Design an enzyme around this catalytic site. Structure first.
Site, PDB file in Angstrom:
ATOM      1  N   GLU A 165     -25.431 -63.355  24.874  1.00 37.38           N
ATOM      2  CA  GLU A 165     -24.375 -62.255  24.927  1.00 37.38           C
ATOM      3  C   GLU A 165     -23.053 -62.545  26.023  1.00 37.38           C
ATOM      4  O   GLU A 165     -21.943 -62.614  25.624  1.00 37.38           O
ATOM      5  CB  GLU A 165     -24.477 -61.107  25.605  1.00 37.38           C
ATOM      6  CG  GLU A 165     -23.514 -60.293  25.519  1.00 37.38           C
ATOM      7  CD  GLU A 165     -23.097 -59.444  24.117  1.00 37.38           C
ATOM      8  OE1 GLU A 165     -23.821 -59.853  22.861  1.00 37.38           O
ATOM      9  OE2 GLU A 165     -22.036 -59.143  24.587  1.00 37.38           O
ATOM     10  N   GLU A 166     -23.197 -63.404  26.938  1.00 36.82           N
ATOM     11  CA  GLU A 166     -22.064 -63.236  28.261  1.00 36.82           C
ATOM     12  C   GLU A 166     -21.387 -65.302  28.600  1.00 36.82           C
ATOM     13  O   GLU A 166     -20.609 -64.827  29.269  1.00 36.82           O
ATOM     14  CB  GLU A 166     -23.274 -63.138  28.965  1.00 36.82           C
ATOM     15  CG  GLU A 166     -23.093 -61.735  29.362  1.00 36.82           C
ATOM     16  CD  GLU A 166     -22.022 -60.579  29.411  1.00 36.82           C
ATOM     17  OE1 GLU A 166     -22.395 -60.002  28.657  1.00 36.82           O
ATOM     18  OE2 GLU A 166     -21.344 -61.214  28.776  1.00 36.82           O
ATOM     19  N   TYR A 503      -9.391 -49.951  25.491  1.00 33.90           N
ATOM     20  CA  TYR A 503      -9.889 -50.915  25.238  1.00 33.90           C
ATOM     21  C   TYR A 503     -10.594 -51.732  27.145  1.00 33.90           C
ATOM     22  O   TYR A 503     -10.597 -51.276  27.767  1.00 33.90           O
ATOM     23  CB  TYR A 503     -10.782 -52.395  24.900  1.00 33.90           C
ATOM     24  CG  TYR A 503     -11.860 -53.072  24.864  1.00 33.90           C
ATOM     25  CD1 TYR A 503     -12.909 -52.120  24.685  1.00 33.90           C
ATOM     26  CD2 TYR A 503     -11.558 -54.174  25.386  1.00 33.90           C
ATOM     27  CE1 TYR A 503     -14.224 -53.693  24.848  1.00 33.90           C
ATOM     28  CE2 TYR A 503     -13.043 -55.362  25.855  1.00 33.90           C
ATOM     29  CZ  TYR A 503     -13.833 -54.888  25.363  1.00 33.90           C
ATOM     30  OH  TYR A 503     -15.013 -55.899  25.696  1.00 33.90           O
ATOM     31  N   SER A 586     -17.268 -49.635  25.157  1.00 30.58           N
ATOM     32  CA  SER A 586     -18.112 -50.570  25.754  1.00 30.58           C
ATOM     33  C   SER A 586     -17.071 -50.574  27.367  1.00 30.58           C
ATOM     34  O   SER A 586     -16.893 -49.410  28.117  1.00 30.58           O
ATOM     35  CB  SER A 586     -17.973 -51.370  25.172  1.00 30.58           C
ATOM     36  OG  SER A 586     -18.644 -52.922  26.009  1.00 30.58           O
ATOM     37  N   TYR A 587     -15.958 -51.106  27.476  1.00 26.07           N
ATOM     38  CA  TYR A 587     -15.274 -51.355  28.677  1.00 26.07           C
ATOM     39  C   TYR A 587     -14.157 -49.990  28.325  1.00 26.07           C
ATOM     40  O   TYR A 587     -13.662 -49.738  28.881  1.00 26.07           O
ATOM     41  CB  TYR A 587     -14.250 -52.907  28.873  1.00 26.07           C
ATOM     42  CG  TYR A 587     -13.949 -52.740  30.185  1.00 26.07           C
ATOM     43  CD1 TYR A 587     -14.659 -53.337  30.920  1.00 26.07           C
ATOM     44  CD2 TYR A 587     -12.836 -52.010  30.917  1.00 26.07           C
ATOM     45  CE1 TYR A 587     -14.403 -53.889  32.294  1.00 26.07           C
ATOM     46  CE2 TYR A 587     -12.288 -52.530  31.617  1.00 26.07           C
ATOM     47  CZ  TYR A 587     -12.411 -53.038  32.489  1.00 26.07           C
ATOM     48  OH  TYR A 587     -12.670 -53.138  33.885  1.00 26.07           O
ATOM     49  N   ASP A 664     -29.334 -49.215  23.678  1.00 24.94           N
ATOM     50  CA  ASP A 664     -28.161 -50.323  23.912  1.00 24.94           C
ATOM     51  C   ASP A 664     -29.012 -51.026  25.123  1.00 24.94           C
ATOM     52  O   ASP A 664     -29.115 -51.600  25.856  1.00 24.94           O
ATOM     53  CB  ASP A 664     -27.105 -49.688  24.546  1.00 24.94           C
ATOM     54  CG  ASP A 664     -25.959 -49.871  24.635  1.00 24.94           C
ATOM     55  OD1 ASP A 664     -25.804 -51.253  24.495  1.00 24.94           O
ATOM     56  OD2 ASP A 664     -24.363 -49.777  24.108  1.00 24.94           O
ATOM     57  N   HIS A 696     -26.036 -50.948  21.143  1.00 25.81           N
ATOM     58  CA  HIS A 696     -24.434 -51.219  21.109  1.00 25.81           C
ATOM     59  C   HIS A 696     -23.155 -50.566  20.367  1.00 25.81           C
ATOM     60  O   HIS A 696     -22.128 -50.407  20.089  1.00 25.81           O
ATOM     61  CB  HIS A 696     -23.975 -52.028  21.935  1.00 25.81           C
ATOM     62  CG  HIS A 696     -22.672 -51.937  23.009  1.00 25.81           C
ATOM     63  ND1 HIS A 696     -22.817 -51.046  24.193  1.00 25.81           N
ATOM     64  CD2 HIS A 696     -21.602 -52.853  22.974  1.00 25.81           C
ATOM     65  CE1 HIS A 696     -21.610 -51.116  24.565  1.00 25.81           C
ATOM     66  NE2 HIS A 696     -20.717 -52.102  23.772  1.00 25.81           N
TER      67      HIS A 696
END
Ligand SMILES: *C1O[C@H](CO)[C@@H](O[C@@H]2O[C@H](CO)[C@@H](O)[C@H](O)[C@H]2NC(C)=O)[C@H](O)[C@H]1NC(C)=O
Ligand SMILES: *[C@@H]1O[C@H](CO)[C@@H](O[C@@H]2O[C@H](CO)[C@@H](O)[C@H](O)[C@H]2NC(C)=O)[C@H](O)[C@H]1NC(C)=O
Ligand SMILES: *[C@H]1O[C@H](CO)[C@@H](O)[C@H](O[C@@H]2O[C@H](CO)[C@@H](O)[C@H](O)[C@H]2NC(C)=O)[C@H]1NC(C)=O
Ligand SMILES: *[C@@H]1O[C@H](CO)[C@@H](O)[C@H](O)[C@H]1NC(C)=O
Ligand SMILES: *[C@@H]1O[C@H](CO)[C@@H](O)[C@H](O)[C@H]1NC(C)=O
Ligand SMILES: *[C@@H]1O[C@H](CO)[C@@H](O)[C@H](O)[C@H]1NC(C)=O
Ligand SMILES: *[C@@H]1O[C@H](CO)[C@@H](O)[C@H](O)[C@H]1NC(C)=O
Ligand SMILES: *[C@@H]1O[C@H](CO)[C@@H](O)[C@H](O)[C@H]1NC(C)=O
Ligand SMILES: *[C@H]1O[C@H](CO)[C@@H](O)[C@H](O)[C@H]1NC(C)=O
Lengths: 719, 719
Positions: A165-166, A503, A586-587, A664, A696
């Site tokens: 994911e990152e 966001y 999310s953010y 999530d 998520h």
């Protein structure tokens, strides 16, 4: 003749179709007809032949397929079973095209986690139960390459959670060399990283625990080893570890990407755990030891003095035809990210793009041209046009292929190239109804409309869409780009309720010349709300000052800049100062919350879907990239200062609706659990909503439920 | 004059006190003073003194005490740490009350579960880390009894989760023989029972996982073993398992309760897992082989042909002075539970109380007297008076002590008897302000008032409370008792919104003449809501046609009976049918949901707090008792038919509010997670709220929030 209705949006009544040619050569691609037949279309001849019938597909109900480069075989992929953003397991039936039959020798095992052909011929590499396997030929008994795979402890050739994911954004972490001579693969160790544990209620009588190794801010990180094996002598020579640069080995670190050059040359990118330094490493094959040699002279440093190395991720090199030089987009001396051309050392790079705008992605490098996307044109930072530049000689010649192609319909483009870049597809996403078109590699002339969206074009013709406008505000030394969505017959002398969609994530950009008939489209069409979206500090593609502005100071300027915009909107005169909401995912949820709890009076309500609530709770790789470390002699103080929990008290006088999915795996329900608990301890009423087992994305009917719930909330908030 | 406030109810402003003498002889009791001293009162002699100083207690900041039978020692309880409902952990210091200093030396270990003295002398028995230890003198080195104690797995002398909440309802599972020559304890083996797992988010970076061995319907139950050990010479023979009766051992079984009649006689009660039959067993210590013997001539079967064996729990025996025969409440021939005197056989039993009402509890059996609580006075099931009947003499006598003690103020009484029933305390709980009083009990004469509640009596003077009324309805052969709470200045001609408080759990009783200033009082006092509570089928204390009518048809008849009532209330003419809500907790949230999804369009909205959603998810003990088993053979079909999920569709046009605490170990959040999941899957909007790290009680600042959030809901629902 009629306004958008929420059911239009949740049924995808007005979704658009895209067309990305599944290239198989310089001139051929494999689309799937309306008949579900899998057709090979040769661009030069114009002839269409069907390789893989709907029937054959149906006989294993395959949802997908993959031609081997030698066209001898095609794998049919079915029993698709999803995991994270990119990962998924599947069963694989490989099919002999020549004999028109399925391959019988040694069936592949079930749940396979990754499988791909070699780039030439018809060799298979696959990942089963966290180990890499190799097949010389479709029906052969597999050769085991790694043995230490173990269900989330050790991963070979697929990432673990954090790296999927990152870092990689990819479901795989093995790469064949250009002609299949070698396979390079990552080994991830998650053995002593802490675990995120949560409940999945499923369908049985007892819930189960789900455990993912998941390094939270400051927690211990996975360790990586990169290996390369000879693909023809895997047992003889055995896997050889790629040496890691000393200045990378000297502390925690990451592998960021791998790029093959020739079969005897591989490019490795590392990133120091403190992510302001990237290293690019070019390794060559020794024959005497049958191993990899990475000389200092071929180590290239990329530093950030005032931020983090890269954009969201580090840039990856794209190499010249000559296979020594490469091109890479990074920050220039002015803090703008542009293409540089690198022969020996990086200190010697020549910048071949420049201006107050940014090179966003390098698509292809040929003998003479370099294709790239950028926001240069008329200097709107949220547009994508694709450009080519000559690379044979200094000053590069410049041609914007897209700028005036369809000026008014299309100012947001991606590109997809065939082999040797003989042809490429252009996909325009907006502002108008999207369109996919086929283009000649040498000349740039369009030779075919691929997808025009005639149905949509015509379906939208009875529907009074909201008016979008993209504009800018200068406030201090800071300029704020904003999309404003407005109701049909937006009588400016009247005061409309405003919704801010936020966001604001580091490296994001939410103001784009993209087309989407969506939820916040519908709120303007039928519900009479004005919608706005604002890019400010920490938002990307406007240079480093604006990007890195939020470094180590997360959830401060994001909040600031949204309020500023809102202030400036209410001052425009047409906004009901008493009906402003804000909603974010999310953010977005983080900032929706910090904004609404800013003691600003401006917001009357706000919604937070799956918010981060404290950087302590989010993944290291992401968090540390922007926040640094939560240690006492680094950045713990702002880790503690920046939670939404601390704003607990400031909810007392606003409507908060707080939403999250109980499953999530990315932004943990933990985040909203702590928020809720904080509101409880501060004695503050709110509305809430969990989605059991949902993640998520909030998929399926969750989405339906989600938007219906928020719509209700919102219609309430605007009486 | 002023209406009640949510603050009033949440602060406990109008809460009341009670007085239970902490007996230590037939004529002495200990009680803690206003300025926190422990004082010995004697009523035979009318003298007092400070047995344990104020500052000696604060010297270890203890919050509880335990004076030994020989008054030579007292225990001091500090570091109280709550586990589940009754279970808790503490620190125990022993005060040498002969010497005036603390006992040093063989100091007791830290976190001890349960501790107590013998009923004679000052011998200690305690459980530390799931194992029983025994002490001779308070300073002696502990003698370990059991050894197989393992956190969360084997429980000696204390219960596992299900035995605590659902069977024994007590923190302990050890019992001394009346003179302390012996010690009886339980072994609970949880090993093979599925754990239930939930998250606990806490305050650390990563939440932790809580596991509890918790048998849901039809799952693997705990296996029980009961042992008896000689206290004086435990080295001699060691612990001895008391025989299990043949019919009990045949299949799965629980240990219902144990009572000691003498030092060589002991009663054990067993429950066949299919809870329609229970076996009372009496056991004698045989001197020769130093073990325990239970003659099958002394096995007394209590079975039910229509429902479950017993009341909520199986009822315990009270043995007459001859220490052989006993008095036990159970179902007479007509279906009403009354006192029987079992002299030697079940069929040979003689019925002692009779008629259309119930003997609720036997409090004391003397040489010549029996004290029992009852449903009898003026055919009112909702109140309890205390009755004294003679024994052993002819012309039998029946006296009601309390029926006219205070006729209008006190109709709900309990009793606390000193040793040999020399003196007893009466505590009345309603309908008026509670009051506690001391009585003679050879003569029954009231000696003095122990707790009058004048603080509450006076504080309620500013306050206009609502008019309460317990009447009954007769409909279609079945009658339904109810309590209606009416707003001050209730206009009979006007129309009022109606809120129903519902529980409905089998064996329960919601309509009671019990003083309680609580939420609904506030809602009638200030909000103008007419409130009703209704006892229908499945409700105890009106015989077996009522009580057992829900057997194997859970959720059916209780829902039906709130509907019939609501309907009758509507045709009383002062209820606005457009404004009706129903709300509940635990079982009450189950039936509120079901009543709301009744598809009868009576309830506009409804609240379900911590509802059971399907009997599959609830504890075996409770569930099977009323439901049978969820198998092919038994009741599966109705476990299947009776969930709330199955009724998702019918929620479409009602306002549902679903509340649940995420650390609810009794009714797992999974219950509400599955309702939510269902409603989404049916595309039905609803309101939800979770309480992070809160259990079934929703105690603390969570209560404030819950009660605030719910009244916002009803207020809006009744707009
Ligand atoms: C601890 O105990 C002493 C003695 O009972 C308390 O002191 C008495 O306080 C009352 C008023 O509350 C006076 O009437 C007495 O004259 C006091 N007696 C003595 C001996 O000083 C003391 O208040 C108690 N402290 C606590 C913990 O409340
Ligand atoms: C699967 O593929 C076949 C092969 O083209 C399809 O068969 C045609 O269907 C059309 C329209 O229904 C018929 O008029 C023709 O007779 C068929 N052949 C052609 C192209 O002329 C079939 O419809 C496909 N669909 C599925 C999923 O069964
Ligand atoms: C409960 O604990 C007792 C000891 O107090 C244990 O003997 C019971 O069963 C045992 O489980 C063991 C570990 O799982 C197993 O190895 C052993 O074979 C088994 N013993 C017997 C008699 O076969 C435990 N209870 C249950 C239900 O298994
Ligand atoms: C849903 O989508 C399809 C195709 O986009 C369309 O034909 C249909 O009318 C839409 N409406 C609904 C709600 O079914
Ligand atoms: C994975 O990590 C563990 C603990 O750090 C270590 O003992 C083990 O050898 C590792 N395995 C490798 C090196 O693949
Ligand atoms: C932390 O909170 C806010 C950020 O908006 C700021 O005003 C305040 O000064 C900060 N305090 C610290 C610890 O720097
Ligand atoms: C809370 O309870 C205390 C003690 O009974 C009482 O004095 C107070 O008035 C209550 N409520 C308020 C208004 O704080
Ligand atoms: C419960 O006991 C009754 C007798 O009281 C018996 O008929 C029945 O078998 C038991 N329950 C079942 C399994 O139906
Ligand atoms: C990151 O590297 C920089 C070089 O720009 C160095 O000065 C700094 O100490 C490193 N760490 C951070 C985040 O300050």
């Amino acid at each position: 003749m009629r306004a958008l209705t929420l059911k239009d949006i949740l049924n995808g009544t007005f979704s658009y179709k895209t067309f990305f040619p599944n290239w198989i050569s310089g001139q051929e691609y494999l689309h799937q007809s309306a008949d579900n037949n899998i057709v090979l279309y040769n661009i030069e001849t114009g002839q269409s032949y069907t390789i893989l019938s709907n029937r054959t597909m149906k006989s294993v109900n395959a949802s997908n397929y993959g031609l081997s480069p030698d066209r001898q075989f095609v794998y049919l992929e079915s029993d698709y079973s999803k995991l994270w953003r990119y990962s998924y397991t599947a069963t694989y039936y490989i099919y002999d095209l020549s004999n028109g039959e399925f391959v019988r020798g040694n069936e592949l095992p079930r749940p396979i986690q990754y499988l791909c052909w070699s780039p030439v011929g018809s060799k298979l590499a696959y990942v089963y139960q966290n180990n890499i396997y190799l097949k010389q030929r479709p029906g052969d008994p597999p050769f085991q390459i790694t043995f230490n795979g173990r269900e989330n402890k050790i991963f070979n050739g697929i990432p673990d959670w954090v790296y999927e994911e990152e870092m990689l954004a990819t479901k795989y972490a093995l790469w064949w060399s250009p002609n299949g001579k070698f396979l390079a693969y990552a080994e991830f160790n998650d053995t002593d990283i802490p675990v995120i544990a949560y409940s999945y209620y499923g369908d049985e009588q007892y819930p189960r625990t789900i455990n993912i190794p998941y390094p939270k801010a400051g927690a211990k990180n996975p360790v990586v080893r990169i290996f390369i094996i000879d693909t023809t002598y895997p047992a003889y020579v055995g896997p050889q570890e790629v040496p890691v640069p000393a200045m990378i080995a000297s502390s925690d670190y990451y592998f960021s990407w791998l790029t093959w050059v020739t079969d005897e040359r591989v490019c490795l990118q590392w990133l120091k755990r403190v992510q302001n330094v990237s290293v690019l490493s070019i390794c060559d094959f020794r024959e005497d030891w049958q191993t990899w040699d990475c000389p200092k002279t071929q180590e290239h440093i990329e530093e950030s003095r005032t931020g983090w190395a890269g954009g969201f991720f580090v840039s990856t090199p794209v190499f010249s035809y000559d296979a020594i030089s490469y091109y890479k987009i990074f920050s220039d001396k002015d803090g703008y990210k542009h293409i540089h051309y690198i022969k020996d050392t990086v200190e010697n790079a020549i910048q071949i793009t420049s201006g107050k705008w940014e090179a966003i992605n390098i698509f292809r490098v040929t003998q003479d041209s370099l294709f790239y996307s950028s926001n240069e044109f008329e200097e709107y930072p949220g547009r994508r046009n694709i450009y080519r530049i000559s690379i044979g000689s200094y000053p590069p010649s410049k041609k914007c292929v897209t700028c005036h192609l369809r000026k008014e319909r299309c100012q947001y483009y991606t590109a997809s190239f065939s082999d040797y870049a003989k042809y490429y597809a252009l996909v325009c996403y907006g502002p108008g109804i999207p369109i996919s078109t086929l283009h000649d590699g040498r000349t740039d002339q369009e030779i075919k409309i691929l997808e025009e969206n005639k149905e949509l074009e015509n379906a939208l013709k009875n529907i009074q869409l909201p008016k979008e406008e993209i504009k800018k505000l200068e406030v201090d030394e800071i300029t704020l780009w904003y999309k404003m969505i407005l109701p049909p017959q937006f009588d400016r002398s009247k005061k409309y309720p405003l919704l801010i969609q936020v966001y604001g994530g580091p490296c994001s950009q939410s103001v784009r010349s993209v087309f989407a008939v969506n939820w916040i489209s519908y709120l303007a069409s039928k519900e009479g709300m004005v919608i706005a979206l604002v890019d400010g500090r920490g938002t990307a593609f406007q240079g480093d000052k604006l990007l890195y502005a939020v470094y180590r100071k997360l959830g401060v300027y994001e909040v600031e800049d949204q309020i500023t915009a809102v202030r400036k909107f209410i001052e425009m005169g047409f906004i009901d100062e008493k009906r402003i909401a804000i909603w974010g995912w999310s953010y977005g949820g983080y900032v929706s919350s910090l904004a609404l709890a800013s003691g600003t009076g401006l917001f009357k309500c706000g919604i937070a879907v799956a918010p981060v609530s404290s950087w302590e709770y989010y993944a290291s790789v992401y968090t540390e990239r922007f926040m640094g470390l939560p240690t006492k002699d680094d950045n713990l103080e702002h880790y503690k200062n920046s939670t939404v929990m601390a704003r607990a008290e400031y909810f007392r006088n606003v409507d908060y609706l707080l939403i999250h999915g109980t499953a999530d795996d990315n932004v943990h329900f933990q985040n909203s659990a702590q928020i809720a608990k904080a509101l409880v301890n501060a004695q503050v009423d709110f509305q809430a909503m969990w989605y059991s087992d949902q993640n998520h994305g909030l998929s399926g009917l969750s989405t339906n439920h989600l938007y219906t719930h928020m719509t209700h909330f919102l219609k309430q908030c605007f009486s």
